Design a protein around this nucleic acid. Structure first.
Lengths: 138, 138
RNA sequence: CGACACCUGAUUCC
DNA sequence: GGAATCAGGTGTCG
């Protein structure tokens, strides 16, 4: 079972923005981390970009092997519900990210499950987002 | 001329609710302020109650002296239009509130007029609504 | 279908 | 103390 942790932030909303990804196995071993600066964006876009990247990163694990679940956890109710089909996606740019993600699910990741989590459970990803932002602004 | 500002809110609709009243002269003098927690009610009931309270306060300006105009300014199309004869009043509880008001007009305040206004221009009355609710919940 | 109002959840921050 | 980015719905009218 793969668990992914995703985070994003944008300073000034919109503003200088970053993404963080943590990938672990069931036991909580960290398989991979990613951190990146993504220019100036909205908060919501940053969350989506983090997810996309994480999904992207999932390839590093071969692109032959699969069928083992993935659970994505993020501190964002909006994107998680939207992914769950619970909440609509209306904003156009967000609609674009959703399409990208949908495509990826279809192509390479059929087993994707999403869970909202509170801020506390996701410090490492948030650490990663900030590491990227600070460095870029420096 | 008397200018009255009226506001209500209910948190959760229905939920904890409050009323705000500001009374002024033509010269922007603030004659009186009223504020109260009213329990849990609908958003619309809260608006009417503020109006009722405002009309009540109007006596503190003596119960002998009149035929000087009154304008009620409030941020509710529903209530303003209903008062104006533009909208029917259907819901049972609202009807009663309307009736209470028509009466006070009948007894005491014949020169009564109603104006709908935007959210931005009603800040003080709205401050009072929230002040009263916050205090009650505290 | 629309007006106005009441909010409510989550996030991003300043 | 504040605002912006994005969703959910109710209370009452037309």
């Amino acid at each position: 079972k793969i668990i992914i942790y995703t985070d994003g932030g944008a300073r000034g909303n919109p503003g200088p923005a970053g993404i963080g990804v943590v990938i672990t196995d069931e036991k909580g071993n960290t398989l991979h981390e990613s951190s990146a600066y993504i220019g100036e964006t909205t908060n919501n876009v940053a969350e989506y970009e983090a997810l996309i990247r994480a999904l992207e990163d999932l390839q590093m694990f071969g692109d032959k092997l699969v069928d083992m679940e993935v659970e994505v956890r993020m501190n964002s109710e909006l994107i998680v519900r939207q992914m769950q089909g619970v909440y609509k996606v209306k904003e156009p740019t967000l609609k674009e990210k959703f399409a990208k993600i949908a495509h990826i699910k279809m192509e390479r990741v059929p087993n994707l499950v999403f869970v909202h989590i509170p801020r506390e459970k996701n410090a490492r990803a948030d650490e990663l987002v900030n590491e990227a932002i600070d460095k870029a602004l420096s």
